[PDB]
């Protein structure tokens, strides 16, 4: 009713230790969401064209052309690691566990309170106003993860959070022929428009049922049950140079020290083994046959163009290129007492050794005369196309059937948790933004809107926008995310790497004297793992 609570606040993380080394992790997240009335109750089709920056020769990468439908609805996203875990629970997980499954997810909206502003300013209660809630359970509306724009709910249980205004990409065409500083022509910079065969205008009113929650109502999305693969919290270190049986050392060191090395007491052209170079007798560590290949090379900072413009080719694993950079604001980890619009940024350097070092590759003629001359080698220091800053490693692809690579690690707290699978015939082997991927169906999105509060002078035949009473809502959101983890076992004599607090990172976990908080990024895949 009007004076009865419809739910409870719960932000506890429960660890239930089943037998056989399996743990259930129930993460409860509760927030107070503050929502304003839409700027306009109409759907807009807006085109963004930053001609000012891309008309300059050399600024192709600064392209921001697109078309989007702007919607009067807002999205409530909780697809980020920081909504569910604090540094302590994250330490416990990444120090005690080895894998991680995604079991269940559920949401609720309760304790809705709608208010009206009257202009000093007076704030009255609208006991009869309503808040529209829509849940796209069938996954009809386009998927839109907020973690890529850093627009999820906040990371603090004691800080009120806002939802993000919903919008989606409308089709368009764009051609941007690249150039450089010193081009003699004006190649082409044209926004064509929309192909009528690809138009797609979605509305929440025509696709999903909308519930109207008043002050004493509550919404409860049932529990969604995932079915995915386990994310591993262990990293691998073995490259192709560390796979299999090492070579037998005929001369072992006698005086234990720092510069006393061992010696394989056999000439390189008199060794035994298998090679894939069928025209040479040398058996070394760079030439011996390994089972497969760990990682691959890919053209880095490469831009492929398509009907909607140029885009960067994504890299699976990096070692610079491949490492994701996260930028975020005061709601998502930045010091809440800083001033300015400069976001906090960090590059996540993963622990896994599955990248490449292009300054150390080379190609040589099949003759293999080992002391190699100039005309029989291609180094990462020779010009390709006459360009001093482009070598062959920039246009090199070594992805083949013998390539083995790992999935991306969780990024606390700004990384995404789950992702939807592409609705194509041939699916990608992994995503670079989320460790988990909903293959068949994924949790539905939760849109919120505040119902139109009309005045007494309303004319639908008036070209001007409707006059509404200034209304805003504050409700409470609750979420339950259930994981399954395995507890790790020690197989080595030596300890392993663990996450801990120390004198350097001490004040990143406690607030300042003025209430300033921050959530620094933590590594996830700490312990090593045997590959072969």
């Amino acid at each position, epitope marked *: 009713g009007v004076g009865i609570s419809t739910g409870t606040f719960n932000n506890q993380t429960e660890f239930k230790f089943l037998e056989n080394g399996w743990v259930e992790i129930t993460a409860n997240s509760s927030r107070l969401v503050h929502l304003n009335m839409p700027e306009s109750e109409n759907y807009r089709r807006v085109v963004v064209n*930053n*001609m*000012d*920056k891309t*008309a*300059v*020769n050399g600024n192709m990468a600064l392209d921001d052309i697109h078309a989007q439908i702007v919607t009067p609805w807002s999205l409530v996203d909780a697809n980020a690691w920081g909504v569910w875990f604090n540094p302590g629970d994250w330490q416990l997980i990444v120090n005690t566990m080895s894998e991680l499954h995604l079991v269940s997810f559920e949401q609720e909206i309760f304790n809705v309170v709608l208010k009206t502003v009257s202009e000093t300013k007076v704030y009255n209660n609208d006991l009869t106003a309503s808040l529209m809630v829509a849940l796209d359970s069938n996954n009809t509306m386009p998927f839109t993860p907020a973690a890529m724009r850093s627009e999820t709910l906040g990371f603090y249980p004691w800080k009120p959070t806002i939802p993000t205004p919903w919008r989606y990409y409308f089709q368009w065409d764009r051609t941007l022929i690249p*150039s*450089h*500083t*010193g*081009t*003699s022509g*004006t190649p082409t910079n044209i926004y064509h428009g929309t192909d009528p065969d690809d138009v797609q205008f979605y509305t929440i009113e025509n696709s999903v049922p909308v519930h109207l929650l008043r002050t004493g109502d509550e919404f409860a999305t049932g529990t969604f049950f995932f079915d995915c693969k386990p994310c591993r919290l262990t990293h691998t270190w073995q490259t192709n140079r560390a796979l299999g049986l090492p070579p037998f050392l005929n001369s072992l060191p006698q005086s234990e020290g720092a510069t006393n090395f061992g010696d394989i007491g056999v000439q390189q052209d008199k060794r035994r083994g298998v090679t894939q170079m069928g025209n040479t007798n040398y058996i070394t560590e760079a030439t011996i046959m390994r089972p497969a290949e760990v990682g691959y090379s890919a053209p880095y900072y490469s831009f492929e163009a398509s009907t909607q413009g140029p885009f960067k080719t994504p890299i699976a694993a990096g070692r610079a290129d491949g490492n994701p950079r996260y930028a975020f604001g005061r709601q998502h980890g930045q010091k809440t007492t800083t001033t300015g619009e400069t976001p906090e940024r960090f590059t996540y350097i993963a622990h896994q050794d599955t990248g490449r070092y292009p300054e150390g590759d080379w190609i040589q003629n099949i003759n293999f005369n080992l002391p190699v001359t100039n005309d029989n080698v291609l180094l990462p220091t020779d010009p390709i196309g006459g360009k001093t800053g482009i070598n062959y490693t920039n246009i090199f692809n070594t992805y083949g059937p013998l390539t083995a690579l790992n999935n991306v690690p969780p990024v606390y707290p700004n990384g995404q948790i789950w992702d939807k699978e592409f609705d194509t015939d041939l699916k990608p082997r992994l995503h670079v933004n989320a460790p988990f991927v909903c293959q068949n169906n994924c949790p539905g999105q939760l849109f919120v809107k505040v119902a139109p509060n009309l005045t007494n002078e309303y004319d639908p035949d008036a070209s001007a926008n409707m006059s509404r009473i200034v209304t805003y809502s504050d409700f409470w959101w609750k979420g339950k995310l259930v994981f399954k983890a395995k507890l790790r076992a020690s197989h080595t004599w030596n300890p392993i790497q663990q996450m801990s607090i120390n004198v350097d990172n001490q004040f990143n976990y406690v607030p300042s004297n003025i209430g300033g908080m921050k959530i620094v990024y933590e590594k996830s895949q700490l312990a090593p793992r045997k590959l072969y």
Partner: antibody
Amino acid sequence: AVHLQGTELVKPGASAGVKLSCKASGYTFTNYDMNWVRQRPEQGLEWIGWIFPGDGSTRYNEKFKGKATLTTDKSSSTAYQLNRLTSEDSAVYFCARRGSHGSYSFAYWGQGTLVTVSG
Amino acid sequence: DIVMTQSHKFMSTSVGDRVSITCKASQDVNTALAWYQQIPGQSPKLLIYSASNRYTGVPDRFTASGSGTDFTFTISSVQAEDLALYYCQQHYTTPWTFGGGTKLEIKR
């Protein structure tokens, strides 16, 4: 019909700053960055920086970093330079705009505003 | 920073001759070069961009060529309205740097 109109002479003392202005007419102001150049009678022309009025994005050179700050004003189509310390920086300042091509050539220049620092 | 040096500061010239101003760059700029003309006491006027292309409205007597570190800007037939201060700008990388200038004269 692109026209850039700068303010006229100024004579500040050797302690303060002066704000030079440049009014643009004849084009979408937010479609082109505004560049500021300097001409001393002995050291030649020199580029101070540029300001993109949409998004208000600046870039200077290392010489005029703490010496000049650029600012834009839409709804009036004006560009401003601040000239912080102005010790003996007496020269003619120009407000320039790219052109139609795409290279950072300067097709349209202002008439120039002279700044003399004395006592 | 790229320093751009024009060979001479004053170049003798008689009306009707062919004059060739030279410009050198500290490092290799591919084409990346613009040529300006300034009458003493006015604003510069853009003559050439990309070291070969002629801006709209420039008379066909001004041409330019070159690449890398050497560039040349030539007038095939001088007029009295062409004796000015010619500047050499590079638009290869920031900061944009100009040359010192070469004033064209009339022979004494």
